[PDB]
Structures are given as structure tokens and as C-alpha cells.
Design an enzyme around this catalytic site. Structure first.
Site, PDB file in Angstrom:
ATOM      1  N   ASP A 265      -5.310   2.760  -3.111  1.00 53.49           N
ATOM      2  CA  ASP A 265      -5.719   4.014  -2.484  1.00 53.49           C
ATOM      3  C   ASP A 265      -6.204   5.139  -3.395  1.00 53.49           C
ATOM      4  OD1 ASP A 265      -4.828   2.486  -0.353  1.00 53.49           O
ATOM      5  OD2 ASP A 265      -2.996   3.647  -0.031  1.00 53.49           O
TER       6      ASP A 265
ATOM      7  N   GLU B  67       3.849  -5.188  -2.531  1.00 48.30           N
ATOM      8  CA  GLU B  67       4.484  -4.866  -3.807  1.00 48.30           C
ATOM      9  C   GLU B  67       5.787  -5.616  -4.099  1.00 48.30           C
ATOM     10  OE1 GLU B  67       2.814  -2.534  -1.953  1.00 48.30           O
ATOM     11  OE2 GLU B  67       1.262  -2.744  -3.484  1.00 48.30           O
TER      12      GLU B  67
ATOM     13  N   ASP C  92      -2.057  -6.898   1.875  1.00 47.45           N
ATOM     14  CA  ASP C  92      -1.744  -5.518   1.534  1.00 47.45           C
ATOM     15  C   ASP C  92      -0.242  -5.215   1.602  1.00 47.45           C
ATOM     16  OD1 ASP C  92      -2.393  -2.884   0.828  1.00 47.45           O
ATOM     17  OD2 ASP C  92      -2.522  -2.268   2.945  1.00 47.45           O
TER      18      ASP C  92
END
Lengths: 346, 691, 691
Positions: free
Chosen positions: C414, C321, C318
Site C-alpha cells: 500500500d 503476513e 493478500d
């Protein structure tokens, strides 16, 4: 990468890349030089749209010049910025100021050598600041032409430099007389009254300067209808008292539908990248500026000046020609006027 | 909980259960019966705060508090004790770089000291909140402080020094003329400058190398291009009899391939939450060693010792308040755009509130022990010299706390050159001096260069700086990068000669200065002293700040104005005008007669260069080489055989001759009023009789 | 400089001297004999930028670009390719977490792909700047891109997959029902929940452990109080046949006693000036591993392998990016006092501009290779499984770049629960799917909890989420900390039963789904597909987004409205209503007849749980276990001996019986229109015939 060095009567013209000088200086008898950058004691580097020229700096070496600087005459230990700016109520050690002469002279072992970088951009002269033993000159352009002017006397350097950039014009003797001025003297009768008192009390006044209050709404080439109803009478009065008249003339043309200079100057004003006219703020309020880099704009302006001179005006006082513009400052003021904060004066 | 101990005139008052920044040894902790009221103190424990109150009379004098940009008598001000990078400080700015939580009260001519051993943000409200009170606020629930009995100011300082530590004895060259700049480079330029200085007659003891010598401001590195051959530089300077002092900051660059970062891992400061405290300093992103820890101190001593082994002679500790720029840079990144002017809040340069340290194994907040950080860094650095088996120690520090005198000299930081600064510097160095830190000085010529308009770089002012610091223990010229070159060799002959003579005069008096340095390291007596130190019973003395005593014998009234002369206030007693021999009666105001108003008080013995000697009146003096000289009515005794060249005797009664050890009689010559000279040029086994 | 190569229908166009984020092997690449204009492209090299132009016709379709919150046909929009923590993203927000610089053009029914191999901030202006043009801007002076010939969309993806990498083959359990939350703890609660779920009839394949399991968010650690016995938790879950997937972020805490920080030293990202890039993430002050480096990747593989050796079954990557919060937090620290609202800029969460990496030995700016960061982290993580000799690999990633399919599943981040989100999620997963990333899904029930008003936590919506994702490859329920408990066991019987049936239905179809997964890992065909994938010649299909194909045979039109039934658009051809047996002619709109609108196209073979088998028409199909099944006129062949329980045959022509391997006959029963069932319950050597 291009590097060409020319020589002529003690002047070396160094060409880096393909320069486009602010103004071209005639160098008649120019012939190719066999002097190398190394014999000249210079190092050159071409980077991101920048040219960096380096010279060593000895402990006893003196560096003078750089024109109007609020610093000690020997320029060492400072990074100077060459960018005309309205300095406001300037204090010492403030830089830059109104004038930019990208010329410095080095005096080593009693011998003077000049270095003139012909770029009207934001040239940086780092004199023993970044590197204690070096003079680093940064020109924010991918190309540049500069000159190494041999001495050996400081006077020799200036003679050659003057020969290169132009001899000072010879003004009349009265231009060196005692001049009285204020911001501003008016109305016209008060101007004459003051001159009379000055002369009556023994002061030889060569000329009187008229500041922006003489104009109509700060419009160039106009007379305030109430403070200066009779300019011809004013001029004759001063001339009868043998006093010259010098009028201030700014560079801002008021964006006014019925203002002659605005209408006749159309087509010769400065623009912005996108194509529109550059509209800013100056004394007259909303204003545009003549693009003096153009020959035709220069012609149009000379005409205006000539006509203004024909009334009997003796001199021209060019002000705010850095060139200065107040649109950005006024913009900040309009948006943060409410905030009880103190703006930084940049 | 209250406990009071007494021992040799020192009362240790313990409130609650204190955890001192550092522990000071007590020869014998004996319980005392003295009560707070007998000590004239009132104490209150509140919300994690201890407030100590003392009355303050109209004529009572309060001195001390170390480095303060205020008048020497501290009344009518609320002082904050918190080390901070003061920037281009001006007068009346508070706080500054050093925090000595000590003040001395002189009431009815009797001196009493009060030392609060807390390195937190202690507040000294001297007759400000309450006109008739001195209120001290310690932001901790517990604290230990000391009431140090006098009665002389010197008595208080002796006891205070005994408690917090005797000043170390530095080498004589540490008091010589030092040249410095921010910065001198590359290496060849350093040597070139030293050569010109020496060639023109300037005796340079050492050169300071500022941060430009490092590689990307990384500690313990040499710039690969400016200092390619450090060993050659070092050999060249030594070959020319010049010491090398290198600046060393406290920031360790957060660099994956930077040795100190890797070896120091585990010994750096952290924040409450457990991560390392990562801030900003010269090297960029940086971490800081937790000097409160023993292992960290040992690790640093090793790095210092390693650095000293190249031949570096001294260490200049800077930015050790400790200072950090992460907050300031942070504000600048967010409001960079906004066309607004920021308020320069100096406290923004301190460590943030969430930083923690491990003191004696216990985890503590930075704000509780902040001021002692430089003390521990200096301690570790000193240990570095011991590790190198280096007897001649020289350490300069910007910040400090009580006890810093054990390890370092202190200079007044980034001062601004101006006529007013001359007076300010005097207050600063005397403030430090009267607070237990003897070896002090200021940047001769002012640090600030030309980054703002209010900087006076005139040459006559520069000369006055050299003259002002004539007798300061630390004599260094330092200038910011953009400042004009201030080395004497770049001055026109007229000014160059003046500086040259002043420096030569300092060296002439060096033996006296160094003897006072010995006195300082043995008894804890300051070298330069405000007049009230020697004449504490005269209230007038607490208002005289443009004059200072050098040792117990010399009074110097530097000219701190553009005038050719000045008014000089003389304390009680007779004073001998060093330059014209005139003897004036004390407790009067006279006009100076020389560019350097120097006076010797009746009862003085001054050792001069070349084994010269000046005696005036009766007194006993100890020279730096341990030789004791005692003068009486008509006899000068020596504790051991010493060579004496010229002997000058000031006396209102005519002197016709002197006899060396009851045998060889020497002719005396009267060179000027009250002055008698004798060419002895020989060893004196034990005494000289005058006739 | 321009060079064009070609090989098996792929043109590699090289502009200047490119330095690819990653290099993709091109087998027998030979100099091309097709010019730029024959390719219909125009190229311009400007200020460190390359602009590639293609015409765009009115009927031309543009698909791809990966994870975009927009309609599947991308026309009339300027897309930005830059991985970013999108926060509580809404529709039409751009960019998002993943960047696949690939788009496919379908003109006159012919598909052509365009892949720009740059991980920089690539801009795809699809008929926005210029209505009749697709303008691609690569912010680099050089670039390599590929023109991938079709003619079928499937052809383009096969070639593209061949070029960038075949999807790995995950274990079957990776497609099972996963329960997750942010977060489940302490360890006993995790087991308690699994027990209730299993006891009530929910087959849970695995549980995901979010950041609360770590000690102070430190990677590779167990919270000392919530997870005192990790080994016991692992064995308890395994005894229940439930896999454990642990989240692993990319931030290494700057901690003096944190092992990964010390062992990773030297392999972290730096900034231009040379220091380490120190930022902010869950652990607080953090540094990040430079995954572009081979040695960093081996280091990470080691930690992953070590972490896997405890019995952890999967890794959930997670915030990769990569995301950093130092800028965002900086702004809050400075403008904290102000009672104003900050503009929510998601780009502020990316790495700052001065961060650098070492790619193939060359130092490069973060902005030039940003999007490939998660690709390399996933690569290193995958290597971690290889190091552990772990054949069953499961890796979930939030961010990605072309080639990410080689190593991980991707979920849509999300999302916010709402009826509109049902449609948004469909566009997101199909966008990824049509762009080469087959294994995708969204958080069933929506991630956002209750931190803002526009969150719909109604139970009937939750059921529709379960129904929506029925055939998505990744089937996971995940919720934010402050969200209501969304596990089915906490639902009233009415809703609990609905979820239970949906999950059971998914497991019934799991064999088919997994067979398609095998197909994906071998040919690069996506599992779920937008209708235009199978019917690219029908323009109508590019506007249908609330329907999707599962493999090539099943059409699912999920109810994404409050209605009981919806309108279903059917492509050309015949379709069989799975629930009522009705056969309808394609290219029509019909009303749904069940809560789960499922249709099989003429020419389908579907393996079901328990060896069941559905066959409709003629076609060939490879089951996940390599067994091939071919159906013809009245015969079904098998590539090898296989067991068959129940066989369902859909046909308009009556079926009376089947013959197994030319011998045994089995009675068939017509259960409903067009539907004939035969209970075989036996092995079938090679074929079945129908009478």
C-alpha cells in the site's frame, strides 16, 4: 539434574541442583542418606527456572505453619504467597503480609512432620487448592535446598527446626512488660508528662516507644531540634522513673549531601542491575538503602546502632524493613493525580 | 391493535402483534368484552416500547417478580428483568440470575396476578417513578400479558401454573441432603469423603461434581488424571446408595478435535452479520448452542442422554443466564496495565447486543428473548432424560424464566456467608416460591470462600445455615475452591452433632416435604411459603420475612441471629408448639422455646418418617403416595388401607383411647400438654375414632 | 554444539540443534575444513538466543535484507525481520511485509553472502550498536545459517538461488500491463472498462478483482448481486484476450454454513491452550489455515484448483503476513469513547503470541516461524495450479520469506502517491531484487486514495509512475476505493497519450524483459538490478539509487523529479544513448536528453517486439525462446533458424551492408549517429556478416 539427600538426627536435607541459600544453616553431623524421595513421599520437578515439590494431602491431614497469615490455623484450601510486603490496613484473608516463614508442618495420623524450604524468593505454597489431594510448593529458582523435619510431636519438629535455624535470643524481663507507644509521642516534655500520669494512676510502664516524629526530617540517628532539644535529659528522666526507651529506626538513608550516614555508608548501599545506586522514596524523601546482605554493610550499621545505643537508648524498633519503598506508588500518583479515577491498591 | 380474551379467570391482553419467547396453550380462547379501564389498566405504545400502568394504593401489596434481593413487598423500587451473572451479590443488588415477569397485587385482601410474557429487559417500576402507580415497560413494540384473577394468592398461582406449566415431580432423593464443592476430586477423594460422611452418621443423598471433573472444562468429558475411571466412581457411589449429579455448562469449546463442537456445527448462536457468536467461558474460546431451535434442543438431548447412560443421576445446569466473559476479558486485556480499579458492571457478562437466535423459524435479537434461554436449555435437558427413559429426573438450574418450573430446581447462586445472608436467602427462595418456582434452595454455608474480607466462615453461622434451610426443598452444601472445608465431618464434635441432628430432623420430616412436592406438581402450590400466602388478609404478614410456612400446616421461625431464642410472630388462629406442646392463640408475638422454633396450626396432618403421623384439628391432606387423610371432630378417615406406626394427636380436650376400624381399641398416652400418643403399628383399613 | 559443512562454495554453519522454518537440500555436503574464525565470525549462545558477529570496515558495503524502506547500502541501522501489515508506510519505516534474512557483504570488491534460515524475529544490527560490527541476533537457542562465497554478487545469488529455489517461469502475459482497483464492480463495469481501455489503444494483459467480488468477503464465493454470472464475466474477458486475477485472502470466516470452514476443520491454526485461534479479518470473525501442515496445504490446493477451474487465470494472495485485526479492534472497542489518538503500532496486526502451528509434525510457536507463513501458503497455492494441470502460473503475494521466489511475484503493498515515493519504490523493488525475488513491482499511481492529506494525485506524477516502472517485471496500476479513477482513459488527451506511449514502449521491450525472466528462472539472476550488481568494484555505484539496470545491457535513469531532464551517472565503459545515438564514455555524469533516459552498454543484444533486434558490440544472449544470439567482430551468429524483421546496429565504425548466411546482401541505412538499420524481414539460418 541434581538430587542429593542428607540426614542428621531426624532432619533430611534435600538438595535440588546447586542451591545458593539466602542464608546458610549449619548442619554439622550431616551424612549421606539412603532415604529416597519416594520413601519421603515427595515428587520433584525442575522446570523453567522453577522447582516444584509435591506431597499428597489426605482429607484428615492438617497443615499448619507458614507464619504470619491472615487465615485459619489449618492452612488447607489456599494458595499462599511468601513475599514480604507492606500490607497497609490489612483485612482478613489478605495475603501476603509482612513476614515470610517458608515452613509448614503436616500432622497425619497424629504424627507431625515439618517441611522447610530455605528460599527467600517468592515461594508459593498451594495447599490443596490447585489439586485437592496435594500440597504443591513452587520455588521460583532453578535450585533449592529444603528440609524434612521428623517429629513425631509438633514440639519435636519445632525443636529440630529451631536447632537448625537458630535459638530465640533471651530478652530481659522488662521486654515483656507493659509498653506504651504512639505515632508519635512528642515533644520530649510530653513524653515524660504522660509517663508520670500513667505511673501516678497505678500503671506499671516498662517502656515507651518513640516513633518517627522524634527524628529531624525523618533522618535516621538524629533528634528533632525543636521537639527533642535535650535527648540526654529525656533519657535520664525516663530512667529515673525506671522506664525503658525504645526508638524506631527505619531502613532508609536520606540522599542528603550533609547527612553523615549517607556519606559514611557510601559504597555499602543497594544498587540496580545497571550499576547505579538504587534510589527510592521513603519517610526521609529521596532515599537509598543499605545492602544488609553484605558483611561490611552489616558492620557499618552495627556501629551506627551501637553509637545510637550509647546515649542510653534501651531498644531498637525496626520498621518498614520488608523492605518497603514508595517510589513506584508515588510515581503513579504523580502521573495520574489529575484523573478523577480511583487507583487500585496493589 | 388490542385484543382481550378470557377463560377460567384469566384475561389474555394482546397488544399489537406479539412474538412470545414461548407460547402458552389456552384451553379456549374466547373473546372478552372487558375493557382496559374495567381491568384498571392503561396502555401506551411508543418507540418500540409498550408501557402498561396500574394504580397503586397505600395499603396495596405487590409481591412476586421472582428472585429479587429485596423485601417481599416490592413497593418503592424499579426492578430490571434481565438474567445476569450477579457475581458475589449483596442485598439490594438487581437484577439477578432469574427473571419471572410476574407480580401479584393484593388489594382489600383480594389477589390479582399480572404476567407479562416477554423475555426481554422488562422494567417493573413499583411506585417509584410515580408513587401511586405500577408502571411496566416492555422494550418491544408488541406484547402479550395476562391478568390472573384470584381471589386467593393460591388461586392466582394455580391459574398461573396451569398457564405456564406444572412443576415436574422429582424423585424423593432429590430433597435429601446433598454435599457439593467447587470441586471434589480426584475420584478416589469423592468416595473417601462419602465414606467418612456415612460412617459418621450423615445420610447423603447425592454428591455434586463441579467443573474440575472435566478435561479442560470441556463438556461431556472426564479429566484423564482426576477421573481416569468414571465407571468405577459411578459404581462405587451407587454401591453406597449415593446419587451423582454432574455440572454441565452451556459453552462448547471451539476445538478442532472436540466432538460436541463438530456435531453441534450448524446449531450454534450467530451474530447479526452471519458469523458464529464466538465468546469466552470456562473452556476458553467458546460458541453457544442456540437452544431456541428445535434441532439444537434435540441435538443437546442426545448428548445429555448419552451422558446419563453412564449412570449419572442428575444434571446441574450452570452459567445459563446465559453468561459470557469475552467483554470482561477484553476490557482487562486493554487496561491490564493501567493502575486503576474497574467498576464491576455485571451486565457486561451478558451476551453482546449483536447476538441472534432462531425462534420458531424467525430470526430474533438476543436482547428480545434473553431470559428464556435457560428455559429452553432446561427443556432440552429434560428431553434428554425422556430419551434415556429415565423416570427419576433431577435438573438444577441457576437462571430461569416463567415456566422453568416444568423442568428444574433453582438455587440462589453464589451467596456470601454472613449473618445478613440468612435473611437475604429467605427473601430469595420465598421470592422464587411465590413466583411459581417451588423447588428452591441456597448453598448451605455460603458459596464464597476466602477471596475477600467480608466473608464469615464461623461454625455457629454454618450451623444456622443448616437450620435455616431445614424445610427448603433443595438442601445442598456447596463451597468455592478456596473456602474452608465445610463438610460436617470436619467440624468439632460440638458443632458436628448439631448439624447431624438437624439433618436427621429434616429426614424425619421428608415424607411431609415430599407430599408437598406432590401437591406442587399437581396444583402448582409452592412448598415453602411466606406467611402472607396463608394469611393474605392480614397486612402485618407482609412485613414478616424471617419466618416461613412449610405447606399449609407448619410455621417455622428460624433463628437468624446469635441469640438463644427469638420473638416469633404468629398469624391468626391457634398454634401448637411442636416441641413443648403449648397451644398459643394467633395474632400475637411470643418468645421461641427451642433452637428450631416449629409450630403446627390448628387443622394439620403431618406425615413423618417411619410411617409416623401427627394430627391436630380438622383438615384433609394428601400424602406423597396418594393416600388421603381426613380428620374430623373425633375421626380420622383414610382413602385406602395404609400402615401406621406411631400416631400423635394434639388436642386441648383429653383423649383416652382410639378405635381402629370399629374393632381393636388402642390405649393412648399423654406425653405432654395437649399431646396424646398411640402405638398403632398396624394397617388401618379405613378409620380411627377418638375417645 | 557447532558443526560446519561446505559444498560448492557454500558453508552451512549449524549452531545447536536447529529446527528450520523449511529445510533446504544440500547435495554433497561434506564436513568443512574451515573454522569459524577463518570465516571471520564470532558466535554466542545465550538465553534462547544466538548472536553472530562479523567485523565491518569503513568501505565495506552491506546490501540485501529484502524489502526495506532504506538506502540500498544498509549500514548504520538495526533492522527487524518480521512480516507486518505496514499500513500507509513511509520511508524509514521498519519492518515491512517481507522478510528475506539475507545480506551480502562486498569488501575489496569481493562479495560474500550470509543467509540465516530462521523465520523468527531476526535482528540485523548493521554497524549501529557497534560501528565496526554487523551483529545478527536470532531469537532461538539454535540456528542454521549459510556463508555463500562469491566473488561476484551474481555468484552469491546463483548459489543462494540454487539453495533456496529457482524462480518459477511465469507466462509472458504476466509481465503485461495490468489494471486493478479496490475494487472494480459489478461485473458489467469490469467489461465496460476493459472495452474502453482497448478501444483507446491500451493493451491490457489482465484485470485484478479485489475483495468486493466476494460474498461478504468469503473466500471462493461470488457476490450474488455484483457478480451473478461469473462464468459470463470470465468468457467476456477471455474473448477480449484479457486474463482474470482474483484476490484471495487467508481468512476463513467462522460461519456455520460456509463450506471452506466446514471442510477445513481440523487444519486451522490453534493457540497454546488447544482451542482454535479465532481472530478478525475482512470476513469478520475468522480462523486461519495452518499452512505449515502438509494436509492443510493439500486442502488449500484443492480449493484453489477448484477456483481455477472456472477459468480464473491468476491468484493474488493478500494479507498473508499473516495479518489479523482482533487486537486492533479490541483496543477500539474499549477505548472508543476516549477523545485521544491511539499510537499506531503496526506490530499489533500480527498474530498474537499464543498462536501455534504444526511444522513437520512438531508443535511450534508462531513467533518462531511467522515469516515463513506466506511461503507455505504460496507453496500450497502453486500446488493448486499443478493440480489443475495449469502450466501458465501467476501468483502475486504481499508477504514472503527466503524461497518465496519459487512460487510468486511480489508487489510493494500500500504505497502512497508522492514524488518521494518514486525513489522509495525503487529502493523497495531493488531491495527485493538483489535479495533473490526477481518478479517485483509497485502499484503504478500509488495505492492510497484520499483518506489523508499527504496524498499527491496530480496527473504528471501519475505519468512518472508509469515511466518509473517501465522495466519493472510486474506492471500494475492499483488504487484504493476512495481514490480518483487512475485508468489512462480518464486522463486528458495530453496525459493519456504519454501513458499510452510508455505502455507501448514497454511492450516493445517485452521480449527482452521476458528473456531476462527466463534467465532468472534458470540462473537466479534478477531482472532489474541496482548498478552495483554489474559494477560492484566501484564504490560510487552504491550511492546511485535513482537508476537501475535492466538485465545486463540496459541502463535506465528514470526522471523522478519535476525537471525536464536530469543528471545521469554512467558506470565504467561506453554507453549508447538509445534515443539520439550518442556514445559516451563511462564513469561520468551527463544530462538526460529524453523523458525516458535509456542507455545500452557496449556489448548488448536486445530482442524487441515484432522480431526487431538491436545489437551493440560483442556479447552472447539467450532469447526467451531458447534461441541464442552471439555477436563478434563483424558477425552475428544464431544457435538456430530464426526470423528477423528490423535489425539495428550501433557502431562507431561505419557499416555499409550486411550479408545473410554468406549469400544474400542487404542495404543498410544510417538513421542517426552510430546507428545503422537494415530491414531484413526473413529467416536467418545461422549468421549475418557486416561490411
Amino acid at each position: 539434574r541434581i538430587l542429593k539427600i542428607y540426614e542428621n538426627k531426624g532432619v533430611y536435607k534435600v538438595v535440588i541442583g546447586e542451591p545458593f541459600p539466602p542464608i546458610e544453616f549449619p548442619l554439622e553431623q550431616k551424612i549421606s542418606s539412603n532415604k529416597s524421595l519416594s520413601e519421603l513421599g515427595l515428587t520433584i520437578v525442575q522446570q523453567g527456572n522453577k522447582v516444584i515439590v509435591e506431597k499428597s494431602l489426605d482429607l484428615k491431614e492438617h497443615i499448619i505453619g507458614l507464619g504470619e497469615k491472615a487465615f485459619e490455623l489449618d492452612r488447607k484450601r489456599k494458595r499462599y504467597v511468601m513475599y514480604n510486603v507492606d500490607a497497609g490496613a490489612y483485612k482478613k484473608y489478605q495475603d501476603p503480609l509482612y513476614v515470610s516463614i517458608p515452613l509448614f508442618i503436616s500432622v497425619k495420623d497424629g504424627v507431625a512432620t515439618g517441611y522447610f524450604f530455605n528460599s527467600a524468593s517468592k515461594v508459593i505454597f498451594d495447599v490443596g487448592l490447585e489439586e485437592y489431594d496435594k500440597v504443591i510448593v513452587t520455588i521460583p529458582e532453578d535450585s533449592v535446598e529444603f528440609y524434612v523435619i521428623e517429629g513425631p510431636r509438633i514440639e519435636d519438629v519445632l525443636e529440630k527446626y529451631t536447632e537448625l535455624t537458630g535459638k530465640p535470643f533471651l530478652p530481659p524481663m522488662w521486654a515483656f512488660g507493659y509498653m506504651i507507644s504512639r505515632y508519635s509521642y512528642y515533644p520530649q516534655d510530653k513524653v515524660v508528662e504522660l509517663v508520670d500520669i500513667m505511673q501516678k494512676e497505678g500503671f506499671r510502664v516498662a517502656g515507651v516507644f518513640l516513633d518517627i516524629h522524634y527524628m529531624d526530617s525523618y533522618k535516621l540517628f538524629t533528634w528533632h531540634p525543636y521537639r527533642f532539644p535535650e535527648p540526654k535529659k529525656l533519657i535520664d528522666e525516663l530512667h529515673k522513673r525506671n522506664v525503658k526507651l525504645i526508638t524506631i529506626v527505619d531502613h532508609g538513608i536520606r540522599v542528603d549531601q550533609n547527612y553523615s550516614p549517607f556519606l559514611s555508608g557510601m559504597g555499602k548501599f543497594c544498587e540496580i542491575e545497571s550499576g547505579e545506586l538504587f534510589v527510592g522514596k521513603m519517610w526521609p524523601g529521596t532515599t537509598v538503602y543499605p545492602d544488609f546482605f553484605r558483611e561490611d554493610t552489616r558492620e557499618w550499621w552495627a556501629g551506627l546502632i551501637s553509637e545510637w545505643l550509647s546515649q542510653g537508648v534501651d531498644g531498637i524498633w525496626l520498621d518498614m524493613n520488608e523492605p518497603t519503598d514508595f517510589s513506584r506508588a508515588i510515581e503513579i500518583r504523580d502521573v495520574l493525580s489529575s484523573l478523577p479515577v480511583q487507583f487500585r491498591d496493589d | 391493535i388490542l385484543k382481550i380474551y378470557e377463560n377460567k379467570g384469566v384475561y389474555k391482553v394482546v397488544i399489537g402483534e406479539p412474538f412470545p419467547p414461548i407460547e402458552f396453550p389456552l384451553e379456549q380462547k374466547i373473546s372478552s368484552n372487558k375493557s382496559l379501564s374495567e381491568l384498571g389498566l392503561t396502555i401506551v405504545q411508543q418507540g418500540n416500547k409498550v408501557i402498561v400502568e396500574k394504580s397503586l394504593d397505600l395499603k396495596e401489596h405487590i409481591i412476586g417478580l421472582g428472585e429479587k434481593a429485596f423485601e417481599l413487598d416490592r413497593k418503592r423500587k424499579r426492578y430490571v428483568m434481565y438474567n445476569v451473572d450477579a457475581g458475589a451479590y449483596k442485598k439490594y443488588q438487581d437484577p439477578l440470575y432469574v427473571s419471572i415477569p410476574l407480580f401479584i397485587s393484593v388489594k382489600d385482601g383480594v389477589a390479582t396476578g399480572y404476567f407479562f410474557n416477554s423475555a426481554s429487559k422488562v422494567i417493573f417500576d413499583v411506585g417509584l417513578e410515580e408513587y401511586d402507580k405500577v408502571i411496566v415497560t416492555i422494550p418491544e413494540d408488541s406484547v402479550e400479558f395476562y391478568v390472573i384473577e384470584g381471589p386467593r394468592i393460591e388461586d392466582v398461582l394455580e391459574k398461573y401454573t396451569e398457564l405456564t406449566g406444572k412443576p415436574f415431580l422429582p424423585p424423593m432423593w432429590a430433597f435429601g441432603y446433598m454435599i457439593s464443592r467447587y470441586s471434589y476430586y480426584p475420584q478416589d477423594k469423592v468416595v473417601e469423603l462419602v465414606d467418612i460422611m456415612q460412617k459418621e452418621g450423615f445420610r447423603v443423598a447425592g454428591v455434586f461434581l463441579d467443573i474440575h471433573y472435566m478435561d479442560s472444562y470441556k463438556l461431556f468429558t472426564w479429566h484423564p488424571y482426576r477421573f481416569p475411571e468414571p465407571k468405577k466412581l459411578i459404581d462405587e457411589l451407587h454401591k453406597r446408595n449415593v446419587k451423582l449429579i454432574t455440572i454441565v455448562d452451556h459453552g462448547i469449546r471451539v476445538d478442532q478435535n472436540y466432538s460436541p463442537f463438530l456435531s453441534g456445527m450448524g446449531k450454534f448462536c450467530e451474530i447479526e452479520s452471519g458469523e458464529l457468536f464466538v465468546g469466552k467461558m470456562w473452556p476458553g474460546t467458546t460458541v453457544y448452542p442456540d437452544f431456541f431451535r428445535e434441532d439444537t434442543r434435540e441435538w443437546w438431548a442426545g448428548l445429555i442422554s448419552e451422558w446419563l447412560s453412564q449412570g449419572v443421576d442428575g444434571i446441574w445446569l450452570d452459567m445459563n443466564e446465559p453468561t459470557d466473559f469475552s467483554r470482561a476479558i477484553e476490557i482487562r486485556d486493554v487496561l491490564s496495565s493501567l493502575p486503576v480499579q474497574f467498576r464491576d458492571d455485571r451486565l457486561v457478562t451478558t451476551f453482546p447486543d449483536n447476538v441472534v437466535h432462531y425462534l420458531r423459524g424467525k430470526r430474533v435479537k438476543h436482547e428480545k428473548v434473553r431470559n428464556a434461554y435457560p428455559l429452553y436449555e432446561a427443556m432440552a435437558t429434560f428431553k434428554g432424560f425422556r430419551t434415556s427413559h429415565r423416570n427419576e429426573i433431577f435438573i438444577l438450574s441457576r437462571a430461569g424464566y416463567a415456566g422453568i418450573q416444568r423442568y428444574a430446581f433453582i438455587w440462589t447462586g453464589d451467596n456470601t456467608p454472613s449473618w445478613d445472608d440468612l435473611k437475604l436467602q429467605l427473601q430469595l427462595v420465598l421470592g422464587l416460591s411465590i413466583s411459581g418456582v417451588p423447588f428452591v434452595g441456597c448453598d448451605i454455608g455460603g458459596f464464597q470462600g476466602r477471596n475477600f474480607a467480608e466473608i464469615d466462615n464461623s461454625m455457629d453461622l454454618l450451623v444456622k445455615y443448616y437450620a435455616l434451610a431445614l424445610f427448603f426443598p433443595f438442601y445442598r452444601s456447596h463451597k468455592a475452591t478456596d473456602g474452608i472445608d465445610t463438610e460436617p465431618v470436619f467440624l468439632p464434635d460440638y458443632y458436628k452433632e448439631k448439624v447431624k441432628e438437624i439433618v436427621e430432623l429434616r429426614y424425619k420430616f421428608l415424607p411431609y416435604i415430599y407430599s408437598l412436592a406432590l401437591e406442587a406438581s399437581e396444583k402448582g402450590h409452592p412448598v415453602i411459603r411466606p406467611l402472607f400466602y396463608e394469611f393474605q388478609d392480614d397486612d402485618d404478614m407482609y412485613r414478616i420475612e424471617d419466618e416461613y410456612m412449610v405447606g399449609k400446616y407448619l410455621l417455622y421461625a428460624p433463628i437468624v441471629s446469635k441469640e438463644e431464642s427469638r420473638l416469633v410472630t404468629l398469624p391468626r388462629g391457634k398454634w401448637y408448639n411442636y416441641w413443648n406442646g403449648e397451644i398459643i392463640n394467633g395474632k400475637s408475638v411470643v418468645k421461641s422455646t427451642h433452637e428450631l422454633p416449629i409450630y403446627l396450626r390448628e387443622g394439620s396432618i403431618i406425615p413423618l418418617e417411619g410411617d409416623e403421623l401427627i394430627v391436630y384439628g380438622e383438615t384433609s391432606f394428601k400424602r406423597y403416595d396418594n393416600a388421603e387423610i381426613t380428620s374430623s371432630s373425633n375421626e380420622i378417615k383414610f382413602s385406602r388401607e395404609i400402615y401406621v406406626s406411631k400416631l400423635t394427636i394434639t388436642s386441648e380436650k383429653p383423649v383416652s383411647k382410639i378405635i381402629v376400624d370399629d374393632s381393636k381399641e388402642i390405649q393412648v398416652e399423654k406425653t405432654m400438654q395437649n399431646t396424646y400418643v398411640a402405638k398403632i403399628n398396624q394397617k388401618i383399613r379405613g378409620k380411627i375414632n377418638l375417645e
